[PDB]
Amino acid sequence: SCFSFRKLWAFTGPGFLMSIAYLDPGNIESDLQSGAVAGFKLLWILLLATLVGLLLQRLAARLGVVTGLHLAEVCHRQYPKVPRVILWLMVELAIIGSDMQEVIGSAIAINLLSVGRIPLWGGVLITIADTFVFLFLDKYGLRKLEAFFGFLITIMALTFGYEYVTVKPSQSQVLKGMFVPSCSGCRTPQIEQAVGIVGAVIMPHNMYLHSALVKSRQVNRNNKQEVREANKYFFIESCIALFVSFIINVFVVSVFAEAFFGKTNEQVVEVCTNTSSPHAGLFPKDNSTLAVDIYKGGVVLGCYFGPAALYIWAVGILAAGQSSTMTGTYSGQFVMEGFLNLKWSRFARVVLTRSIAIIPTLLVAVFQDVEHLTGMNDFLNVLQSLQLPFALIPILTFTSLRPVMSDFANGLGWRIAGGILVLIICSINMYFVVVYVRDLGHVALYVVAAVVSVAYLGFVFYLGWQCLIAL
Amino acid sequence: QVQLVESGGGLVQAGGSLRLSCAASGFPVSRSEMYWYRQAPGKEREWVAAIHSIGWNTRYADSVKGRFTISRDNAKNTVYLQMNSLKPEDTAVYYCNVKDAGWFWTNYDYWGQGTQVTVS
Numbered sequence: 001s002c003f004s005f006r007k008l009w010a011f012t013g014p015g016f017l018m019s020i021a022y023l024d025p026g027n028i029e030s031d032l033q034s035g036a037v038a039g040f041k042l043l044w045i046l047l048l049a050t051l052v053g054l055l056l057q058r059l060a061a062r063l064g065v066v067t068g069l070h071l072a073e074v075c076h077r078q079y080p081k082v083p084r085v086i087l088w089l090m091v092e093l094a095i096i097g098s099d100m101q102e103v104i105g106s107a108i109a110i111n112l113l114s115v116g117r118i119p120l121w122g123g124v125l126i127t128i129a130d131t132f133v134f135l136f137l138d139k140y141g142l143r144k145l146e147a148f149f150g151f152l153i154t155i156m157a158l159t160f161g162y163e164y165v166t167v168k169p170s171q172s173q174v175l176k177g178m179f180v181p182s183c184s185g186c187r188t189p190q191i192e193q194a195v196g197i198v199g200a201v202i203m204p205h206n207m208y209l210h211s212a213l214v215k216s217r218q219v220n221r222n223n224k225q226e227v228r229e230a231n232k233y234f235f236i237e238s239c240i241a242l243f244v245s246f247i248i249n250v251f252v253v254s255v256f257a258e259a260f261f262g263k264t265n266e267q268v269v270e271v272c273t274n275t276s277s278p279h280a281g282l283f284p285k286d287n288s289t290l291a292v293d294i295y296k297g298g299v300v301l302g303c304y305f306g307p308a309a310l311y312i313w314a315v316g317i318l319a320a321g322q323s324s325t326m327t328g329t330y331s332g333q334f335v336m337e338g339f340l341n342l343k344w345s346r347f348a349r350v351v352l353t354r355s356i357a358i359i360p361t362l363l364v365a366v367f368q369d370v371e372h373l374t375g376m377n378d379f380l381n382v383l384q385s386l387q388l389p390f391a392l393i394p395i396l397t398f399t400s401l402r403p404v405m406s407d408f409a410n411g412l413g414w415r416i417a418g419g420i421l422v423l424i425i426c427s428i429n430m431y432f433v434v435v436y437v438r439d440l441g442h443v444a445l446y447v448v449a450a451v452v453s454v455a456y457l458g459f460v461f462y463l464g465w466q467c468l469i470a471l
Numbered sequence: 472q473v474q475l476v477e478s479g480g481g482l483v484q485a486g487g488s489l490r491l492s493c494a495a496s497g498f499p500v501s502r503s504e505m506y507w508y509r510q511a512p513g514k515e516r517e518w519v520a521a522i523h524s525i526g527w528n529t530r531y532a533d534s535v536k537g538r539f540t541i542s543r544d545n546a547k548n549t550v551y552l553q554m555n556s557l558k559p560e561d562t563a564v565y566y567c568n569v570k571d572a573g574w575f576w577t578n579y580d581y582w583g584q585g586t587q588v589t590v591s
Contacts, residue, residue, distance in 0.1 A: 038525045039502055180574035185523025262501040262545045289527050
């Protein structure tokens with residue numbers, strides 16, 4: 001049988017969780033930036049990031065189904081103890097990083113929805129109910145959650161689809177932007193945003209989810225007829241799930257690039273006064289450009305297209321916040337299960353991630369204002385960017401060795417493509433790390449920064465060397 | 472369909488200041504890169520500066536940095552140069568050019584009508 005909807009339906013379910021794992025509030029903010037910084041021109045990189053991410057997903061599905069152990073478990077059996085644990089903490093930092101920008105995303109959504117009545121720190125404390133929810137599920141132990149993901153995608157698409165219809169962007173521009181890569185006259189900050197988007201799309205821990213989710217399904221490893229079909233249908237399920245997420249992502253970028261591109265602060269202030277929305281003093285009266293964030297972007301969108309659009313945007317962010325949390329605990333539970341072989345319930349994982357995440361976030365909210373609160377999102381975005389490759393070297397390093405993947409190793413073209421990719425990502429990171437070091441130019445603060453940079457480069461180079469032997 | 476008209480030509484003494492404008496219509500100039508040129512008498516056309524606007528970045532040529540400033544008003548669909556401390560070597564025919572990639576592998580160049588600027 002070439003293809004059958006019956007086999008698809010019987011082998012679905014990993015795509016549902018994978019889809020929502022690709023729309024964390026970090027990604028929405030990442031797609032938000034291109035809407036007012038680069039417009040439609042920087043849209044093709046989104047497709048390239050998704051396409052590479054999908055190609056990485058198929059490797060996660062291959063590794064997950066070829067051997068019963070997921071990628072975290074097989075990581076425990078390959079690297080030495082010191083590289084294992086240091087990698088273990090490195091990937092963990094992504095989950096705390098992922099949960100950190102989520103609570104900023106959720107808190108901002110509360111503040112916009114509450115017309116400023118509920119304060120910022122109120123939003124930060126309002127996500128503790130998410131932890132309370134996770135405890136309640138653990139007591140009940142439903143353990144299915146597939147309807148939650150399906151509904152969560154449904155509200156996401158409906159909310160952002162309403163945004164796309166209301167904005168009504170020109171289909172010519174988005175088609176010309178997506179299918180024709182063009183990006184000229186850019187400096188280091190522009191490519192810095194470019195690497196930010198590709199890092200934000202390919203989240204490092206999504207490989208662990210797919211490996212574990214594929215492992216859940218039962219399949220005869222020894223017999224070669226079951227694994228090939230299971231691999232094919234899981235790959236096609238990833239393609240559908242990734243296509244839906246990318247369609248939603250292109251919805252947001254096209255929405256924010258149509259009307260919020262090249263608009264000075266005077267014009268948006270003028271329309272805000274005409275609409276008489278109370279949130280009008282945020283934009284200063286000057287000739288300078290417009291800067292967009294979750295708080296500001298929702299405000300101007302509400303000014304331009306009524307409070308209805310703002311509230312729908314706030315709801316959409318909240319759905320993203322819930323999605324990032326659910327994939328956050330799922331990622332954290334599986335990695336700790338595999339790497340150091342520790343069994344912890346989901347309630348333990350969310351409590352650890354949330355309690356660590358809200359400690360700085362509530363403090364900066366009390367001390368600094370909301371503009372700096374979204375300013376911290378820059379720090380998380382770049383930190384996630386330097387640690388983006390840690391999802392690349394491990395996946396092919398492990399899905400390249402003959403003993404571990406049996407005779408289902410990747411073809412020659414896949415190996416050379418990965419080798420080019422890791423070299424490209426290594427060169428980009430070493431290019432950026434020296435620039436970030438030069439930014440400070442201190443005497444001893446540069447020393448500790450240099451020591452950290454030396455350690456991270458040594459880890460990255462060792463993984464790269466391991467990949468080269470593997471390939 | 473592409474149209475560009477330059478306004479702000481004339482005679483100015485060395486060390487003066489003046490503001491030049493390219494006004495264009497028929498396309499969304501806000502979304503497209505904007506380049507600027509000057510053709511000195513007896514010399515070839517040369518890259519002066521351009522507002523690519525992918526991040527509202529402004530790039531200047533070597534003999535231009537620190538002396539000329541650029542701005543744009545997409546509301547008026549127009550671009551402005553403010554030139555200060557004009558030196559006698561600045562004498563040239565000034566032209567406004569739009570580089571529409573065409574979403575293909577070849578670009579198309581459209582020039583304005585050309586304004587003459589004189590420096591003593």
